[model samples]
Target: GSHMRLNGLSPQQQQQTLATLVAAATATVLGHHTPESISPATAFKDLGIDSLTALELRNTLTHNTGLDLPPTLIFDHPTPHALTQHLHTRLTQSH
Candidate 1:
């Protein structure tokens, strides 16, 4: 019942998109002032991300993917590796 799009982009493109999304979400949640300091292994709590930041990240991902993910995804996964894994599964399965 997922609503993700898999019509045009190749698998590599999907992976790149997912990586871009993760970086953007990290920057947005961690603050634009120190985006360069963020790494894939960084923890959400260490970045001081709260509900508002989580919401912002959710909105960003939704905007990029056109898929409305549950807000709990941020808390449930709360790491780039976890989110990337989820995205990989979604994208691969969609194909």
Candidate 2:
């Protein structure tokens, strides 16, 4: 489970935290032990993520970030950086 707190954080900090979380979540789905190997620019499709794993990734992120993400979150973002930016925007806007 994610332990990062999002509220009352700087924009840069939030982005960094979200990026780390996204990398970790992606690594978890791909069976990697650490997020150090994940690249934020790499596309999910390029990472061999299909619909099933995409949904799993989404669920993990939803639980982690406590965001009411849509089912097409992965497809819409396509990459970790994109997803991070999207999440950052939502997190910032909601406040």
Candidate 3:
């Protein structure tokens, strides 16, 4: 948690940071700046997230948030909104 660098962020700030992480991670795999398609309602699979890319996203989130996430993270969350909400809860509770 010390490495998260997100201490004291408000709920909206946490949500924005999560969204940025998701967008950046997705863009990394997509080989382009993917801003338009990275929305809460968008399915990860719709953003071109295959198994490997899903791992990429999970690893990125773990690295950025300093959270120990499961390897099956993307499968479990499936959507950005779900993942963001889950992460927000975890981050808020870590203190």
Candidate 4:
């Protein structure tokens, strides 16, 4: 299915999908980290993530969510809480 077809998923499914997406994005951008260790409050900066990694993360999110996200999305939403909120909004309105 298209990555844009998330609206058909239940809330749990959406969260699970999002978590997986975030894990992949994070790993690609922030290096390896166990998914269980990620939290809504986790800060990419605190984790030693750089601008290039941030850009990669943003691109990953855009590709997976099919949203034309801003390049500074990671800078603006530095924490998992903010990122999740952004993802939730995008997912909710994806249809």
lDDT of 2 by residue, 11-91 (tens): 888988988888888889878747777787899888767898788888878778777788688898889888888878776
Scored by lDDT, model 4 comes in at 0.73
User: Positional deviation of 19 in candidate 2, in angstroms?
Assistant: 0.6
Model 2 scores a C-alpha lDDT of 0.80
lDDT of candidate 4 over 1-95, digit per residue (tens): 55566777776677667766766677667767565556657787876568887888888888888777887887998865577668867878744
lDDT measured at residue 32 in model 2 versus the true structure, 0 to 100 = 78
Report every candidate's CA lDDT: 0.67, 0.80, 0.76, 0.73
Runs with alpha carbons beyond 4 Å of true place in candidate 3: none
Backbone clashes in model 4, listed as residue pairs? none
Tens digits of per-residue lDDT for model 3, 36-90: 5587788888878889878888888877787878767779988787788877777
CA displacement after TM-score superposition, residue 21 of candidate 1 (Å):
1.7
Over the stretch 1-95, how does candidate 1's per-residue lDDT look in tens digits?
34457547876676656866777776876676444455658766566678887777777776666676777767988876567666656656643
The C-alpha TM-scores of every prediction are 0.70, 0.86, 0.83, 0.78
Q: Which is better, 3 or 4, measured by TM-score?
A: 3
In candidate 2, stretches whose alpha carbon ends up further than 4 angstroms from where it belongs are: 1-5
Q: Judged by lDDT against the true structure, how good is candidate 3?
A: 0.76
Model 1: per-residue Cα lDDT at residue 75: 92
Better candidate number, 2 or 4, judged by TM-score: 2
Best by lDDT: 2
In model 2, the Cα lDDT at residue 7 comes to: 65
Per-model C-alpha RMSD? 3.7, 2.5, 1.9, 2.2
